[PDB]
Design a protein around this ligand. Structure first.
Ligand SMILES: CO[C@H]1/C=C/O[C@@]2(C)Oc3c(C)c(O)c4c(O)c(c(/C=N/N5CCN(C)CC5)c(O)c4c3C2=O)NC(=O)/C(C)=C\C=C\[C@H](C)[C@H](O)[C@@H](C)[C@@H](O)[C@@H](C)[C@H](OC(C)=O)[C@@H]1C
Length: 138
């Protein structure tokens, strides 16, 4: 995938290693993928495939990444972890919602980041943790 490229569909995507199926309704309050033990207030979704693939790859869990197309029941807002942080605005088109979402499809035709790019991201995040700089906004 290409960073900042909006998916053809305009649809909201959710990358995860959870075993979801079309027709599931997902409510907030599951555990963070980035800070063990943290109970989440939001569901995180995106309109770029690149951000969804990172969500699938970086999600906690055994088993492979999945990307779902989802329909929010309620309001969505910019995800502050990636908005006005490294870049101005929200170029990854990443959002979050306090209300449930429905799983309406599964994206089957994606490929992951090349392995050294995924390893660099993983290593970078462990480093931020080791330095106490991995602040999670939620
Ligand atoms: C869609 O976002 C993805 C890719 C964007 O593509 C791309 C090109 O545009 C980015 C934007 C616009 C950012 O604002 C950004 C950012 O703020 C950030 C890191 C992190 N960089 N490092 C980690 C590895 N590394 C390169 C060295 C340091 C980034 O790489 C990016 C970044 C990119 O890479 N944040 C930090 O540095 C700091 C200080 C803290 C991070 C804290 C928590 C832990 C994270 O926020 C968690 C909650 C997730 O939100 C991220 C892991 C995102 O994963 C998902 C699934 O969302 C990932 C950024």
């Amino acid at each position: 995938p290409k960073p900042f490229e909006v998916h053809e569909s305009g649809a909201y995507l959710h990358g995860t290693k959870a075993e979801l199926k079309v027709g599931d309704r997902l409510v907030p309050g599951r555990e963070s993928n980035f800070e063990a033990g943290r109970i989440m207030n939001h569901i995180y979704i995106t309109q770029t495939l690149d951000a969804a693939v990172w969500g699938a790859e970086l999600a906690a869990g055994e088993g492979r990444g999945r990307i779902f197309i989802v329909e929010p029941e309620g309001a969505i807002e910019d995800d502050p972890n990636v908005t006005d942080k490294k870049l101005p605005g929200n170029p990854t088109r990443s959002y979050r919602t306090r209300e449930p979402v429905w799983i309406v499809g599964e994206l089957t035709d994606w490929v992951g980041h090349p392995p050294e790019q995924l390893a660099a991201m993983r290593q970078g995040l462990e480093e931020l943790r080791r330095k106490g700089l991995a602040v999670i906004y939620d």
